RNA sequence: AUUUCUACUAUUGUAGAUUGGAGCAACACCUGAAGAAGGCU
RNA sequence: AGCCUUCUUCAGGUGUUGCUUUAGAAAG
């Protein structure tokens, strides 16, 4: 059950020292330097205003771009620092050589390197930078003037560009400008020869040199931090712990980019559309057979998309991709750009039939577009004359459905409901009421009385009665409005309920998903080309005598000195502060070293240390034919000798990695051995004065903080702190990835400094890798290949649980069967392998004890019940003060009404499904607050009492679906939100202040934590039975019937009506977003693949990433029940689930039967 | 009180859970608009 | 001319669901 897969694990750590009086002081030996560096980090940490700022920035970067384009080639003026010149040697790909000056004027570099001037490489790099930022300035100019035109003309508000592509275009443009302007603001590009008096003819350079580009840099950084801030966290730095990974150059995704364009068949699509006019591409897409192309799996997904719905290629990827594929094919870039632009051009059949009528055809338009036009304009035709091609729309709908549409009951019912809505709209037109309303009343009555119901609707007659009563006599407006809203819901959900059309929409789900994934991956890997500086800091972890750990990060652009050597030169062996840094190698680095070696005459490759003088290096065979030369034995032997006896293997001391290539007879074996053994945590020491000189020199001393490692009695209770102190043992199996990103979160106003949101919080997010050292392991990139192919993943699951069932064949296993519902969020039953109901779980309780000494107060746990079939809903694993882990019921201990009231008693309940119920009620109120706003303000009309206010809510909000109807309504929070909405609608009716109230609250965190309690329970039981256990779950993927949505009264279809309907998600929407089925599934399965003992990771379910990896697996056969085994988890069919006397409830029986259905076929199968 | 989430306590914190970043698709509603159709005055 | 409804489209927001990509040293 050992883990054979590589795993990543982000361990986030705070970097802001809390200074509360009730927080233990930590990092005291370097406290002054921590507080100094906090002020350093505080000083550089900060849709119509955004675009005004973008237009201001675009004007400054156009001015800067046009000024820089006339300076960069005047090489007698530019001078570079030595660190900048070396980074230019790496970036412009030449040899630095020997420069014996701190300031290198480009009037030097007249020497030759590989057939060119040395300064010409710098000038050509800057010229390429100018060209790329000019192209991105053109793209950003197009988007910016488009969005500005949409802004300052309220008529044209529908022409806004995509904001994600707008933001990402500015991020690429900001990177490209920043590569030039950051050395200008830092002085790494300076102009020393400006002292001579030539202002009569060279004054334009004088305005360039003394201009403050710090202002432009900070304004661009302001926009970047505005764009990059997601969730309140702004990226601060990207620190490396391995200094060879510093000064990193962007990854080349050439093979990955070319594979997506191959998958898109984009080259062949531009082949059949290049040279066409913009109207001829339109006629090509018009004359395409929509239905045969849409279902043709071998077509382009781009073509298969534009024959169902007009879906244009996104702006950023389309301009990166047009320039990408225009180059090697010799195409004109404008022609391929025109082809890419005309793909997915929106066309309206209604607007086109309005303009002209002859030559019109619904086959010219995509399936959804023409279907919508035909269905809507034919529904209007059954009660009035409509100017549209009536028989053509009939023919189109009959071709789609195979039957005579406008004779079907469903389409007729849609036409009646649309006509009813139209006549109610005319009769409601209060400003322009008709002179003769009687004939509209007659029309409504006639349409309601001649209507025929296609199926059963329970409440339709009530809606009809209320609407007819309102129009005829005027009884009620509330019931009439509710009835009209429900009829609108029915009519909206009726569109296409006649299977031939839901199939096409379900196919478009995957087709548009592949379209979006491929273009998003292409955009992410084309944006990678301009990620010039990934690493900004080089850092070490500094440990002192109290085992506190710091982060001494130093900017790589901070000054003209070498900032990799600055930290490392100050390391000693007998100092007081132990420093750590990662010494590691990967197959990624190896393949970067082998392929990029150069054997040209004038070239001095930077990788000549890595490569020895054997026979195995042949550049053409490595470059053009790598995947065939990697299997040749001469290259394997050459790579082994390059890793053993090269210059780089003795300079970097690669013999300390403990490599052994006596078993590696292949290149994949070499890469695996490198990825397995190559990790050492290089421990050195540094002094107090060295840290003082570095922090005073501008470096940042971020203190690594969490609750456990900065407490008084520093015992590791968290798994992140346990992993943190497992990393610094130097063990190979649990590594520290050298790269990690520091971010910051600005304080929220209205929050005190005693809380983390009223504090500027810096977070270090370390990545820790689990690399199995016992033999062959599967790396992360091999894993994503298996996750992306369902046949490979099916075979992997089959071989994994073949391995598992051999282990637990002749063992005395138990079976852990879990039911899921709403009455109990999960209930668990443990069975013996013969089916005997086990379970002697002691259920404890907490009571807080106030000791005489105040800091010695603690929780004492006492046993309260003995339960056998557990209700996991109110349980959480608790560790007592004696170290024993017990099961504690949260509901047994009351909680206090107001937090931080030590002298008051506890009088409130602590059920978790009550929390879910309250959040669902809040989300239902916020939904009706958006859609039915005045109805929501009517709830507090005359300052109601709580009972009559609850009665008022019961006419607006649906119940939860569990417990009594409106059991635990959050009235004191609901009335506060409605009063806040009344206040916001008063004093100006601002929309953002409304959106802070009316928008739905996220439900994922509450139910994630509530499920995490239960996952801890299941982990405790699984480890209790010595991991020789089986787990059984339902297959809750099929919805046998319909449901009503929690938000509206909307009907949620079954799986029969729509094959993509999942029972868990249908029930989630039934509860207004508070379903805990898939959360329990995903959290249990993500727990079971990483179950961690003292120092070893034990894996009990196969490797998976998505939900289509654990669903859509091979089910076992030749048994009683249909079960899908996923490691130790069996997803049995839920059909007929709901010491035999241990069953007391209706769902204890369900959990016992879920366990028993797995017991039976584990008996039969093995 | 939190790396963060959840539940707490007021114990210089507690217990469980914790892989983070960028997006993509479908849906729901809101907001800003456009097009067409029918219709009202 | 004003105005209402209806369908579709566009942009954003917030949710719900899934789904990918990325996360160690890239010179002909």
Short mmCIF file of C-alpha atoms in Angstrom, two decimals, chain A residues 58-319:
data_model
loop_
_atom_site.label_atom_id
_atom_site.label_comp_id
_atom_site.label_asym_id
_atom_site.label_seq_id
_atom_site.Cartn_x
_atom_site.Cartn_y
_atom_site.Cartn_z
CA UNK A 58 -1.15 53.12 -22.69
CA UNK A 59 -0.35 56.75 -23.48
CA UNK A 60 2.77 56.62 -21.29
CA UNK A 61 3.98 53.30 -22.69
CA UNK A 62 3.32 54.43 -26.26
CA UNK A 63 5.37 57.55 -25.49
CA UNK A 64 8.07 55.44 -23.84
CA UNK A 65 8.00 52.88 -26.67
CA UNK A 66 8.33 55.54 -29.37
CA UNK A 67 11.15 57.22 -27.45
CA UNK A 68 13.00 53.95 -26.78
CA UNK A 69 12.75 52.89 -30.43
CA UNK A 70 15.04 55.81 -31.35
CA UNK A 71 17.57 55.25 -28.53
CA UNK A 72 18.24 51.49 -28.35
CA UNK A 73 20.45 51.37 -31.47
CA UNK A 74 22.54 54.44 -30.55
CA UNK A 75 25.05 52.20 -28.80
CA UNK A 76 27.58 54.93 -28.00
CA UNK A 77 25.27 56.18 -25.20
CA UNK A 78 23.90 53.08 -23.43
CA UNK A 79 25.96 51.58 -20.61
CA UNK A 80 25.19 48.43 -18.62
CA UNK A 81 26.08 47.18 -15.16
CA UNK A 82 28.11 43.99 -14.84
CA UNK A 83 25.22 41.97 -13.42
CA UNK A 84 22.96 43.37 -16.15
CA UNK A 85 25.55 42.54 -18.82
CA UNK A 86 25.83 38.97 -17.54
CA UNK A 87 22.04 38.60 -17.50
CA UNK A 88 22.05 39.97 -21.06
CA UNK A 89 24.64 37.34 -21.97
CA UNK A 90 22.21 34.74 -20.69
CA UNK A 91 19.14 36.38 -22.27
CA UNK A 92 20.57 37.41 -25.65
CA UNK A 93 22.43 34.06 -25.69
CA UNK A 94 26.10 34.96 -26.00
CA UNK A 95 29.29 34.70 -23.96
CA UNK A 96 29.97 37.40 -21.38
CA UNK A 97 33.73 36.98 -21.64
CA UNK A 98 35.99 39.09 -19.45
CA UNK A 99 34.82 42.64 -18.74
CA UNK A 100 37.21 44.30 -16.29
CA UNK A 101 34.91 47.28 -15.60
CA UNK A 102 31.91 47.69 -13.32
CA UNK A 103 30.24 49.94 -15.91
CA UNK A 104 30.31 48.49 -19.43
CA UNK A 105 29.62 51.18 -22.01
CA UNK A 106 28.32 49.70 -25.27
CA UNK A 107 30.93 51.80 -27.05
CA UNK A 108 32.96 48.78 -25.99
CA UNK A 109 31.93 45.26 -27.11
CA UNK A 110 33.41 45.90 -30.55
CA UNK A 111 34.86 42.39 -30.41
CA UNK A 112 33.45 39.44 -32.28
CA UNK A 113 31.38 36.53 -30.99
CA UNK A 114 30.04 33.91 -33.43
CA UNK A 115 30.21 36.15 -36.49
CA UNK A 116 28.79 39.35 -34.99
CA UNK A 117 29.48 42.31 -32.73
CA UNK A 118 28.79 41.71 -29.04
CA UNK A 119 26.77 44.93 -28.75
CA UNK A 120 24.75 43.86 -31.80
CA UNK A 121 23.36 40.92 -29.82
CA UNK A 122 22.13 43.30 -27.11
CA UNK A 123 20.72 45.68 -29.72
CA UNK A 124 19.01 42.80 -31.57
CA UNK A 125 17.52 41.50 -28.33
CA UNK A 126 16.15 44.96 -27.60
CA UNK A 127 14.91 45.30 -31.20
CA UNK A 128 13.05 41.99 -30.90
CA UNK A 129 11.67 43.22 -27.57
CA UNK A 130 10.51 46.45 -29.24
CA UNK A 131 8.86 44.50 -32.09
CA UNK A 132 7.04 42.15 -29.71
CA UNK A 133 5.84 44.99 -27.50
CA UNK A 134 4.78 46.92 -30.61
CA UNK A 135 2.61 44.00 -31.72
CA UNK A 136 1.17 43.73 -28.22
CA UNK A 137 0.69 47.52 -28.14
CA UNK A 138 -1.33 47.19 -31.35
CA UNK A 139 -3.46 44.42 -29.83
CA UNK A 140 -3.93 46.31 -26.56
CA UNK A 141 -4.70 49.49 -28.52
CA UNK A 142 -7.44 47.66 -30.41
CA UNK A 143 -8.95 46.27 -27.21
CA UNK A 144 -8.58 49.56 -25.33
CA UNK A 145 -10.16 51.79 -27.96
CA UNK A 146 -12.90 49.18 -28.40
CA UNK A 147 -13.71 49.16 -24.71
CA UNK A 148 -13.44 52.96 -24.46
CA UNK A 149 -15.85 53.28 -27.40
CA UNK A 150 -18.18 50.94 -25.53
CA UNK A 151 -17.76 53.03 -22.36
CA UNK A 152 -18.28 56.64 -23.44
CA UNK A 153 -21.16 55.70 -25.76
CA UNK A 154 -23.89 54.01 -23.72
CA UNK A 155 -25.54 52.95 -26.98
CA UNK A 156 -22.48 50.81 -27.81
CA UNK A 157 -22.23 49.06 -24.42
CA UNK A 158 -22.58 45.63 -26.08
CA UNK A 159 -19.23 45.91 -27.89
CA UNK A 160 -16.92 45.47 -24.90
CA UNK A 161 -13.95 43.10 -25.31
CA UNK A 162 -13.29 40.11 -23.10
CA UNK A 163 -11.76 41.39 -19.87
CA UNK A 164 -9.65 38.29 -19.23
CA UNK A 165 -7.94 38.73 -22.60
CA UNK A 166 -7.71 42.50 -22.03
CA UNK A 167 -5.99 41.91 -18.68
CA UNK A 168 -3.69 39.20 -20.03
CA UNK A 169 -2.75 41.30 -23.06
CA UNK A 170 -1.76 44.06 -20.67
CA UNK A 171 0.21 41.56 -18.55
CA UNK A 172 2.21 40.46 -21.60
CA UNK A 173 2.70 44.07 -22.69
CA UNK A 174 3.70 45.02 -19.14
CA UNK A 175 6.31 42.23 -19.06
CA UNK A 176 7.71 43.31 -22.43
CA UNK A 177 7.92 46.99 -21.42
CA UNK A 178 9.20 46.07 -17.94
CA UNK A 179 12.19 44.18 -19.36
CA UNK A 180 13.36 47.53 -20.78
CA UNK A 181 12.12 50.04 -18.21
CA UNK A 182 13.05 48.25 -14.95
CA UNK A 183 16.80 48.50 -15.75
CA UNK A 184 16.13 52.13 -16.71
CA UNK A 185 14.50 52.90 -13.35
CA UNK A 186 17.15 50.87 -11.50
CA UNK A 187 20.01 52.46 -13.44
CA UNK A 188 21.17 49.23 -15.08
CA UNK A 189 20.71 51.14 -18.34
CA UNK A 190 22.33 54.55 -17.94
CA UNK A 191 23.71 57.18 -20.30
CA UNK A 192 27.14 58.38 -19.12
CA UNK A 193 28.16 60.11 -22.38
CA UNK A 194 25.36 62.69 -22.03
CA UNK A 195 27.66 65.12 -20.20
CA UNK A 196 29.00 66.44 -23.52
CA UNK A 197 27.20 69.50 -24.87
CA UNK A 198 25.18 68.32 -27.88
CA UNK A 199 21.71 69.62 -26.97
CA UNK A 200 21.35 71.40 -30.31
CA UNK A 201 21.01 68.13 -32.24
CA UNK A 202 20.56 65.35 -29.63
CA UNK A 203 18.08 66.88 -27.16
CA UNK A 204 15.62 64.00 -27.61
CA UNK A 205 18.00 61.63 -25.83
CA UNK A 206 18.46 64.18 -23.03
CA UNK A 207 14.72 64.12 -22.33
CA UNK A 208 14.94 60.32 -22.36
CA UNK A 209 17.80 59.88 -19.89
CA UNK A 210 16.74 62.27 -17.11
CA UNK A 211 13.07 61.27 -17.36
CA UNK A 212 11.84 59.50 -14.22
CA UNK A 213 10.90 56.02 -15.41
CA UNK A 214 10.36 54.99 -11.80
CA UNK A 215 6.94 56.64 -12.16
CA UNK A 216 6.08 54.61 -15.26
CA UNK A 217 7.38 51.43 -13.62
CA UNK A 218 5.29 51.94 -10.48
CA UNK A 219 2.19 52.82 -12.52
CA UNK A 220 2.59 49.67 -14.64
CA UNK A 221 3.12 47.75 -11.41
CA UNK A 222 -0.05 49.30 -9.99
CA UNK A 223 -2.01 48.02 -12.98
CA UNK A 224 -0.31 44.60 -12.79
CA UNK A 225 -1.09 44.23 -9.08
CA UNK A 226 -4.66 45.31 -9.81
CA UNK A 227 -4.91 42.65 -12.52
CA UNK A 228 -3.03 39.88 -10.71
CA UNK A 229 -4.95 40.22 -7.41
CA UNK A 230 -7.34 37.26 -7.28
CA UNK A 231 -9.18 36.48 -4.07
CA UNK A 232 -7.52 39.42 -2.32
CA UNK A 233 -4.00 37.97 -2.68
CA UNK A 234 -1.46 39.89 -4.73
CA UNK A 235 1.74 38.17 -5.91
CA UNK A 236 4.73 39.68 -4.12
CA UNK A 237 7.73 37.55 -5.10
CA UNK A 238 8.83 34.19 -6.50
CA UNK A 239 11.77 33.00 -4.41
CA UNK A 240 14.11 30.15 -5.31
CA UNK A 241 15.98 28.02 -2.78
CA UNK A 242 18.26 26.56 -5.48
CA UNK A 243 20.40 29.36 -6.87
CA UNK A 244 21.02 27.61 -10.20
CA UNK A 245 17.29 27.94 -10.90
CA UNK A 246 17.60 31.70 -10.38
CA UNK A 247 18.01 33.83 -13.53
CA UNK A 248 15.63 31.36 -15.16
CA UNK A 249 14.70 31.60 -18.83
CA UNK A 250 11.13 30.80 -19.94
CA UNK A 251 10.22 27.21 -20.74
CA UNK A 252 9.80 26.31 -24.41
CA UNK A 253 6.47 24.57 -25.01
CA UNK A 254 7.16 24.08 -28.74
CA UNK A 255 6.23 20.39 -28.69
CA UNK A 256 3.13 21.12 -26.60
CA UNK A 257 2.06 24.13 -28.68
CA UNK A 258 2.52 22.25 -31.96
CA UNK A 259 0.53 19.30 -30.61
CA UNK A 260 -2.52 21.43 -29.80
CA UNK A 261 -2.49 23.09 -33.23
CA UNK A 262 -2.19 19.58 -34.69
CA UNK A 263 -5.18 18.48 -32.59
CA UNK A 264 -7.19 21.55 -33.61
CA UNK A 265 -6.43 20.79 -37.29
CA UNK A 266 -5.99 24.55 -37.48
CA UNK A 267 -3.35 24.40 -40.23
CA UNK A 268 -5.71 22.51 -42.52
CA UNK A 269 -8.56 24.86 -41.63
CA UNK A 270 -6.57 27.95 -42.59
CA UNK A 271 -5.46 26.03 -45.72
CA UNK A 272 -9.07 25.73 -46.90
CA UNK A 273 -9.86 29.35 -45.98
CA UNK A 274 -6.71 31.33 -46.84
CA UNK A 275 -7.13 33.70 -49.77
CA UNK A 276 -10.90 33.81 -49.41
CA UNK A 277 -12.67 37.11 -48.94
CA UNK A 278 -14.24 37.86 -45.57
CA UNK A 279 -17.62 37.21 -47.21
CA UNK A 280 -16.35 34.02 -48.87
CA UNK A 281 -15.32 32.56 -45.50
CA UNK A 282 -18.84 33.49 -44.41
CA UNK A 283 -20.22 31.60 -47.42
CA UNK A 284 -18.00 28.60 -46.64
CA UNK A 285 -19.42 28.48 -43.12
CA UNK A 286 -22.91 29.02 -44.55
CA UNK A 287 -22.67 26.19 -47.09
CA UNK A 288 -21.24 23.72 -44.57
CA UNK A 289 -23.60 20.87 -43.77
CA UNK A 290 -24.17 21.64 -40.10
CA UNK A 291 -25.48 18.31 -38.84
CA UNK A 292 -22.99 16.00 -40.56
CA UNK A 293 -20.02 18.22 -39.64
CA UNK A 294 -21.12 18.62 -36.01
CA UNK A 295 -21.29 14.86 -35.42
CA UNK A 296 -18.14 14.12 -37.45
CA UNK A 297 -15.57 13.34 -34.74
CA UNK A 298 -12.71 13.68 -37.26
CA UNK A 299 -13.34 17.36 -38.03
CA UNK A 300 -11.71 20.35 -36.40
CA UNK A 301 -13.20 21.21 -33.02
CA UNK A 302 -13.14 24.79 -34.33
CA UNK A 303 -15.33 23.78 -37.28
CA UNK A 304 -17.48 21.51 -35.10
CA UNK A 305 -18.02 24.47 -32.76
CA UNK A 306 -19.07 27.10 -35.32
CA UNK A 307 -21.69 24.72 -36.74
CA UNK A 308 -23.62 24.68 -33.46
CA UNK A 309 -22.92 28.11 -31.93
CA UNK A 310 -20.87 31.07 -33.13
CA UNK A 311 -17.84 30.89 -30.84
CA UNK A 312 -15.01 33.19 -31.92
CA UNK A 313 -11.37 32.51 -31.07
CA UNK A 314 -10.41 34.65 -28.04
CA UNK A 315 -8.55 37.85 -28.78
CA UNK A 316 -5.20 37.17 -27.09
CA UNK A 317 -4.67 33.63 -28.36
CA UNK A 318 -5.88 34.55 -31.86
CA UNK A 319 -3.15 37.17 -32.32
#
